RNA sequence: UGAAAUGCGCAGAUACCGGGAGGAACGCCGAUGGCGAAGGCAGCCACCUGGUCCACCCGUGACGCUGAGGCGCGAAAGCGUGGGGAGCAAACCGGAUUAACCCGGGUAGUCCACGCCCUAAACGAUGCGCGCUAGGUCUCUGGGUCUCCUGGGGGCCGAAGCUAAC
C-alpha cells in the first residue's frame, strides 16, 4: 500500500527488482531490510552484489 | 483467528502425480490445525539463494490460510517432516512479502 | 505545587525576555496580588481573558525609560520577585514583627486578616498576615 | 490474545449507568482483567521481568483505586471488592 | 612476526574442489539511531505479553508527585549439580628479545539452563524528581495535519546563572 505506489517494498516474492545492500534508496528502509532478508531465505543471491 | 501465509518448496524432480500428492497432504494437514485454504498459487521453478540438498533449484508453492495463532509452529513442523518438502516459510496477513 | 510562586516566576522571565504581556491561571488570590503590583507600578496592569473557555489573568509588563546611552533593553521595573512564606515553610508575622520591604521602594504582599495588603497597609490597620512575597 | 470485544461486557457490567466507561469501578474492573491476563503470562514466561514490572504497576495502581473509593464512599468499595472476588 | 622456534612427521599436510557430523557466533542495512525500570537486547518469522507516543476528544474524576524499609534485578567474574560441542583464552609450556607479552601450541577453564551472588556502573542530563515558564535557525525520528503542532537526539546561539570547565 503506502509504498511509493510503484510497488510494495515488502515484495520479496517477485525479486525481479534488484536491490541489495544499498544504503541510500529513499525515506525509511527498515521495512525493506526485513524484505530482502525474507527473500534471501528463499531465493535472493546473498553473495555480495555491487 | 490470525490470517497467515506459508511458502513451501518441494523437490524440483517430482512428477505431476507426486506433486499433486504433496499438495493434497499439505492442504489436508492444514485443515487438521484449523487452517482454511483461502487461495493457492503454483509459482514454478526459480533459483534458490542457496543449494538445498545439493539442489540449486526447487518447486515453490503458495498458500494462504487463517488458522489458530497458537498452532502455526505446529504446522510448519508437520510440513517440514516430508522428504520432498525442501523448506517451509510462514509469515502473516494474506500474501507473503 | 505552588501556584503563586509559579506565577510570580512567569512575571520575572517575562521581563527578562522583554515581552508585552504574559498569561497566567485565573485565580482570586492571584488577581488581588496582580492588582496591588499595578497600583504601585510594578506592572502596567492586568486583564481577564477566557481561552477556549479557560479563564486566565494575562498581565502587562511595565518598563521604565531608555537606558543611559546607546543600548536597547529598557530599564526594568521589577528588579526582583521572590516569595517568603511558602508551602512547607509557613512564615507568619505580627504587626510589630512586620518585615521591611526594600527601603520603602516596593511592597511586601502580606495576607493579613484584612485582605491581601502590603507592609504599610497592615502596619496602619495594625494587622499581621502571611509573607506572600517581597517585590522590588 | 483476548482483550478487544469482552471489554464491552466488563464495562457495561460495572457501568453505574448507560454511558459510563471510566468510573472507579470500571477502571479497576478492566484493570484487574489485565492483571489476570498478565498473571497467566508470567506463569508461562517466568523469565519475563519487564512485563512482571508492569504487573506491580497495575496492582499498585488498582490498590490506589480502591483506597480512594474507600475513603470517599466505602459503600461501593465493599461491593466492587466483592464482585471482583478480591479478598472475600 | 621484521627473526625464529614451535607445529605439520600413521601420512601426503596448508592455500584448492564436493560431501558429511557438531557447536558457537550470528555480516551489508546498524546511523550524531531506537526501545526498556536498570541490565541488556539488533538474521528473519509466528505466538504469548509489557511500557510508551499521537488523535477525536465521550467518561470517571486529581483517586496527585517524589520517596526511606521491603522486593526483584547488572557487563566480565568466582561457586554447586546435570551436560555436549566449538571459538578464544589469564595461571601453565616454548622460541626470541633480553644479555619478554610480541609470536606459536594449548588442557583446566570461559559456555547454556536453574540457584546463590549482585561492586565500580552507565553516566556526569543523577541529590532523586515534578509542574510551570523563555526560546530562533539547520539536519534527523514518530503521529495527525501539511508557512503547523505535540513528543526525542545532535550542532551554533540570545537572556540569565556559574569568573575560578569560558
Curated annotation (Swiss-Prot), chain B:
Subunit structure: Part of the 30S ribosomal subunit. Forms a tight heterodimer with protein bS18.
Superkingdom: Bacteria
One annotated Gene Ontology cellular component of this protein: ribonucleoprotein complex
Disulfide bond annotation, renumbered to this chain: none
GO biological process, alphabetically ordered: translation
SUPFAM superfamilies referenced in this protein's UniProt entry, alphabetically: Ribosomal protein S6 (SSF54995)
Free-text function comment from the UniProt entry: Located on the outer edge of the platform on the body of the 30S subunit.
Molecular-function annotations in GO: small ribosomal subunit rRNA binding; structural constituent of ribosome
Family the UniProt entry places it in: Belongs to the bacterial ribosomal protein bS6 family.
Keywords on record: Ribonucleoprotein, Ribosomal protein, RNA-binding, rRNA-binding
Protein name: Small ribosomal subunit protein bS6
Extent of the signal sequence: none
HAMAP family in the cross-refs: Ribosomal_bS6
Curated annotation (Swiss-Prot), chain C:
Assembly and oligomerization: Part of the 30S ribosomal subunit. Contacts proteins S5 and S12.
One of the GO biological process terms: translation
GO terms of molecular function: rRNA binding; structural constituent of ribosome
Pfam families from the UniProt entry: Ribosomal_S8
Cellular component GO terms, alphabetical: ribonucleoprotein complex; ribosome
Keywords carried by this UniProt record: Ribonucleoprotein, Ribosomal protein, RNA-binding, rRNA-binding
Classification lineage: Bacteria, Thermotogati, Deinococcota, Deinococci, Thermales
Name used for this protein in its record: Small ribosomal subunit protein uS8
Family the entry assigns: Belongs to the universal ribosomal protein uS8 family.
Function: One of the primary rRNA binding proteins, it binds directly to 16S rRNA central domain where it helps coordinate assembly of the platform of the 30S subunit.
S-adenosyl-L-methionine listed as a keyword: no
HAMAP family, per the entry: Ribosomal_uS8_B
Curated annotation (Swiss-Prot), chain D:
Entries under InterPro entries matching the protein: Ribosomal_uS15 (IPR000589), Ribosomal_uS15_bac-type (IPR005290), uS15_NS1_RNA-bd_sf (IPR009068)
Domain of life: Bacteria
Tagged with keyword Ribosomal protein: yes
CDD domains: Ribosomal_S15p_S13e
Entries under Pfam families matching the protein: Ribosomal_S15
GO molecular function, one term: structural constituent of ribosome
GO cellular component, one term: cytosolic small ribosomal subunit
Cytoplasm keyword on record: no
One annotated GO biological process: translation
Alphabetically ordered keywords of this record: Ribonucleoprotein, Ribosomal protein, RNA-binding, rRNA-binding
Described function: One of the primary rRNA binding proteins, it binds directly to 16S rRNA where it helps nucleate assembly of the platform of the 30S subunit by binding and bridging several RNA helices of the 16S rRNA.
Family indicated by similarity: Belongs to the universal ribosomal protein uS15 family.
Subunit structure, interactors included: Part of the 30S ribosomal subunit. Forms a bridge to the 50S subunit in the 70S ribosome, contacting the 23S rRNA.
Protein name, UniProt field: Small ribosomal subunit protein uS15
Source species: Thermus thermophilus
